[PDB]
Symmetry: D2
Subunit: 464 residues, 4 copies
């Protein structure tokens, strides 16, 4: 089967119990709820239909909450009509949010435009459609020299490549969505426009302040500032989502492929889950089959090493959402089956988990059984891309859902684990029940014995 996990953004056409039941059947693993739109009654009902489907069907899934996040936007123009800009003209941005725009001026929502920017910096409007150079800055106006032609519309996003922007890490609306996340008991939170480590902690504080300590934080990297602080941002998050489309607006186009690859590699080396997202199968919002391009992009993303691939509009609003998940599952299976283990890499956990993967492959073990509380143990084996499927045994309900996103992982919640010998017994029974192994197969069993929950130190080889 496939090992790479599929995040599906759920929307009006896919929030029914009947659809979610088939969305999982087709390969969906994590439900994404995009709070950029929708209201608390909408999502809470979507959450309920899934937990209804899971309870009745017996399948497992995770639920991810994604924040709107901070952003800079233009506003309206006179007559609400587009305006055509010409290169070389002088253009001006104003802080005054009460101004209606025109061909010489438009208003912006963030006052720190003047302080953060400096003469020589570039300003990009509407996903980089129109670019401009800042030539002078005065009070409540920002003077620019237009660099390229384009049609400016109303309420368009603005980007400042290579510039340290001083936005708040979260908007006030974000704070309320996060709190709703804690009340619902969500498993993951993906936070938009994370630029620096301080941003990651502020979310962690807020979740800690409302019972979201056991919630894993997924930081979305979207610009060069985030990329520049990526190492620190990874250290502070529980995982990463690579938002390739947005970064493409911020950095040289040929670096994006090497930005995604590095980040995947660094998440792998760190035993932290990674999602590759945006411009995945966009051509399928309207079409029943994807491009040659889209599938190859996805296939290179799995070969880079990502844990998960994410469907956005394709599944929340698309006209062929079920076909999108299904073909994604076909791409993942086809791509996952020709990848090899990565047995390189002094922690005790690292030495033990890496050796167990080599031993699994040295014995053609179809399954590596892992006892985990917080999930680090299943993620330590995953770093080595084992051919074996990882059945992770836990009593912690959150852990089981969160491992739904880790590559190659099959979570199974169990009542209790009393000792090291019990783990081997219980795991042996369950290895047969899971159907992934059979009598006569070898399994490798990883646990921590007489050590804290944070370390993995034991490896044992059993026959089923």
């Amino acid at each position: 089967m496939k090992k790479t996990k599929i995040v599906c953004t759920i929307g009006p056409k896919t929030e029914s119990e009947e659809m979610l039941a088939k969305m999982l059947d087709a390969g969906m693993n994590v439900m994404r709820l995009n709070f950029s739109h929708g209201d608390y009654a909408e999502h809470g009902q979507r959450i309920q239909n899934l937990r209804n489907v899971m309870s009745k069907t017996g399948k497992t899934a995770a639920i991810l909450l994604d924040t709107k996040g901070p952003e800079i936007r233009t506003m309206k123009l006179e007559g609400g009509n587009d305006v055509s800009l010409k290169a070389g003209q002088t253009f001006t941005f104003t802080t005054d949010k009460s101004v209606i725009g025109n061909s010489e001026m438009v208003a912006v929502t963030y006052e720190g435009f003047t302080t953060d920017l400096s003469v020589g910096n570039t300003v990009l409007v509407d996903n980089g459609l129109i670019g401009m150079e800042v030539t002078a800055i005065e009070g409540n106006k920002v003077i620019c020299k237009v660099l390229n032609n384009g049609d400016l519309g109303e309420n368009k996003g603005v980007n400042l490549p290579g510039v340290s922007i001083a936005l708040p890490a979260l908007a006030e609306k974000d704070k309320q969505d996060l709190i709703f996340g804690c009340e619902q008991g969500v498993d993951f939170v993906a936070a938009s426009f994370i630029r620096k480590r301080s941003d990651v902690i502020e979310i962690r504080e807020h979740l800690k302040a409302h019972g979201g300590e056991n919630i894993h934080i997924i930081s979305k990297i979207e610009n060069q500032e985030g990329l520049n602080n990526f190492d620190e941002i990874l250290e502070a998050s529980d995982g990463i989502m690579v938002a390739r489309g947005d970064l493409g607006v911020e950095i040289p186009v040929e670096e994006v492929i090497f930005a995604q690859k590095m980040m995947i590699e660094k998440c792998i080396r760190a035993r932290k889950v990674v999602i590759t997202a945006t411009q995945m199968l966009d051509s399928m919002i309207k079409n029943p089959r994807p491009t040659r391009a889209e599938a190859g992009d996805v296939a290179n993303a799995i070969l880079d090493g990502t844990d998960a691939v994410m469907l956005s509009g394709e599944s929340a609003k698309g006209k062929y959402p079920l076909e999108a998940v299904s073909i994604m599952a076909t791409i993942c299976e086809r791509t996952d089956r020709v990848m090899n283990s990565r047995l390189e890499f002094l922690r005790i956990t690292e030495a033990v988990c890496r050796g167990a993967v080599e031993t699994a492959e040295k014995l053609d073990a179809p399954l590596i059984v892992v006892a985990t509380q917080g999930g680090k143990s299943a993620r330590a084996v995953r770093k080595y891309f084992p051919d074996a499927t990882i059945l992770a045994l836990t009593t912690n309900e959150k852990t089981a859902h969160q491992l739904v996103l880790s590559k190659g992982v099959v979570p199974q919640l169990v009542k209790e684990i009393t000792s090291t010998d019990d783990f081997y017994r219980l795991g042996k029974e369950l290895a047969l029940q899971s159907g992934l192994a059979h009598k006569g197969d070898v399994v490798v069993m990883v646990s921590g014995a007489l050590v804290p929950s944070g370390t993995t130190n034991t490896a044992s080889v059993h026959v089923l």
Copy 2:
């Protein structure tokens, strides 16, 4: 200095002496001539303008001719207006070329349409826009049931995924173009829609018959039949072109990307050139910048190991030919400078060449100087992706040109090389003259000594 080579299809906007020179300044190495269109006055002019540009400046490049080839196409419709075909409807193809089409029946260009097809096959019209199922075949009619809605127009290509097609290897015009190739001294010949080894052999007989025995044939793989027989085609060809676009229609969408990787890998091991083509940076036909998607696709083909990447419309019929090349060349460098040698893989030529690269690397040699007659020696080294640049000294002007298409090779024509010790003298001098090495650097020099051409047997180390 990039190692990957760029093929550019030259057209009206890029056929000037002044422009071609600016394409070469920008990194162009090979001129492609797409003989689907244009006439002998047009093509002969491009060849002359290049040789004028080459003659005056001293830069060197290659000339590749790309054939139209055999094909199956629809014909004209009533009133020359589009007709909408509906899923479930019955549609029919006819052999009678004087029949006007309609919503229920159209004429085809291939008379063997009925005999080649069988009950159950899929028929695709206009690059897969509309697909149909064959339901019956009788005489001069082909009966089908339409599977998807779309407008069938005039002059639309026909594709038979998973179906073995029995067309001829050359059209009468193909025969006339190749002879013009022989007459003009083309360096390469690209052969479209290669399905079997016999297709390549037919071309070789043709080319040998007009004094172009030394002209390299690069087989373009364009359907599922070619892919099944790829191994035999490579043996008979001099190289391969991966046509990702055309294969995208003939084979399941999740297989295409691995067909590229597989096909490229075998070209490397065989010491035969491989080009990745079609759907490179198409969007630059209209836009002055590529998408993030394209540049990741292109560069990942370089990481696969491709020798050369090809521009089609971007440089033939496009608005931004210089911008297309430059971003291509910048992608080649950004990608090439992070790729490593591949020093695995009982022959003499290989053992010496693999040893020469490993020695050069262990001694921080910037350069491998190679004495070659037909270039087989330069292409044996290239297999291992050496960090060091290859200075290929030859007395055969065709080889000097043909070796411009291979990755990392800087060819140099010489008056003579009388002996092995003579080669070391001259090769050391020319290494310094090129500016690619400097006094004191280590250079590694590979030649055949006291053996006929085609074998490389000697490897030597000098300080400049």
Copy 3:
């Protein structure tokens, strides 16, 4: 500090409790009893004196019983006088044991002398002093032509190089000596003159019938036939003793060094103990310091990989018993400490035991703690020449004694181990009690969990 173990033949000057105590202080590990000489009261007394010192001191050791074995010997001469034989003369051996010899004929003790030999064989008398070539065989006589001059004495041993001899596998006296071995509870039994597997099985039967199922058989390979069947013999024994001296008499002198090197390496591979003996430090029978050569021979034995090195007369019938053992311990200490682990060379037991040693080195673990019943698991670790010391915890007292002979092993007997977590608890306490580890050191612990005795499947890393 040393890892190689020292076997000592104990004799009149070293059988007192006061000596045994100082021999262990000097490095002795195993006592050997040469049943070639002595009677049941002497050997039984040595066993008692050692076990008294063990009881008083708390030190541990093993008891090895070495058999006389079968043999072919000359017999009595006229007047008990030496006779001089001359090269070229005819000499005759007779089966008639009532014939008194002289310079033309002597009797032998083995009735099969006439049948086993053939015309052309070599006959060697008195440790190779005198050689003869068989020229004819008639009735009860073997006729020979003497090849070199020498003095034939009374009761001289005979060697028949390259001849398959039909002697019994055990002497009638041997049968009783082994029964005494069982009665006393010896740990090892070394069996002389093993030629074929059938010999080893007869010994195993004999031990079974008197309660010696737990006694390990150590087969002494002493002739060409022993060597030819070495595998068949090794498969059935629990170990090997290399009889260097006799091998010099049976096989070309250039092969003996390569018989030894093999036997050690194949014993290493089989997880079965190997002892190197004979011609070790003979010169210390009379002198207080060994040869330059002797010390070099002894050290190359340890480097080949032998588990233990053995002293004979040096410690049994000699003037400097403690000085010899002491210098032996100095050679072992000095030699062992520059030897390296061997991390090469399907089964489960092997995969884990090689991984535990590879884990131990990557973590600088000074000790590898093993729970073992029958000693196999502790011996499976040693196969890889671990830098670390092996602390083998067992409840089988015979195993605890027998494991004193395997290189690098420290036995410690315990009451019980009820489970895998219990094993880790106690092992950490007992690791520190031994003084071989300290707070902060890492230990690796090898066990069998939920499998029967004979398989090793679990390895675990703890910090003390």
Copy 4:
């Protein structure tokens, strides 16, 4: 055939042309001349019969001269009677060369005895037979306390363990022996009792000052002072001789075995010849067959990596010199056929010669042919212990002789070599004539091209 080379000390029973002829047929390669005894006419004549034998048959050998060297010896006793020394007694050595000795005091030949020695140092007389500890030093006498009983005889050697001895670097007679060496054109010189680099330099000055500039210095390591300065001594010398007998008396006995191995390895890494000498097959001075210990001591010296093994009294003054060499050859061979290459270890000669050997083995070439004038080229290849035999082609007659001592090297004198391509021509022809390779076999050819002598930079692979 064997690769290890044999040095033989030649004497009266082994100086006849007929016997030298039989010594070479049996495997003798280098003649040793021990200037401890004999006079210039005797040594000059042995030199003559060899160069006569070489010329007549065409078989080849080299000539080595061994110095007596400086030394400390006791002198004569009263009535020339042995005196019995007892443990604990006071004994005294005197500088006065006019004193006749007795049981309480004897004279020594070295004036610096009092100044070099110190209270607490050990004094050893007659192969370490009697040892004494200095208790006081006054005027020209050194007082001692004897440690063991023993009989002191006349004219006995003295050894001072761990003491920096300030004798001259050469004895006065040695200077004349070297001058005699320069006259005869000996190829090698063994210089005894080398303690420091300055010692080797005094010899080098002396040899050059009399025209022996191309004579190689083989420094004899015999005491602790040399060992501490070994690195410089090898660096300053042309090769090393391991004199195990002398070391056995000067340093702890368990260190001797590692002193041999270390020096053999370091000479290997330096591309400098190493001879292992003393206590090789001594038992054959009196016996026609060697000991198992001796057969193993030598065979382990070859496995250690020695270029040469040396016979002393065995071949100079013993009863079975011819049998000794033959069995020495049988051991060398039996061992030589089981050794493997050692292909580790960024200099140009190193990179190229190591690459040729792996390629030689990757193609099963039975021969590597090397072009050398100063011999460095063959000794760089030999270092990696190639299976292929090194056919070393040279124009320097001395070089051809000096390479007779180097392991696995077959020297060949040739008229001239006019080019690199000439070497390939001639080398292919001579490879076939030599009988070591045949038509269809691969040969690997190593030469230096367009560089000064001392550098090897070219490797070429040819079919015969």
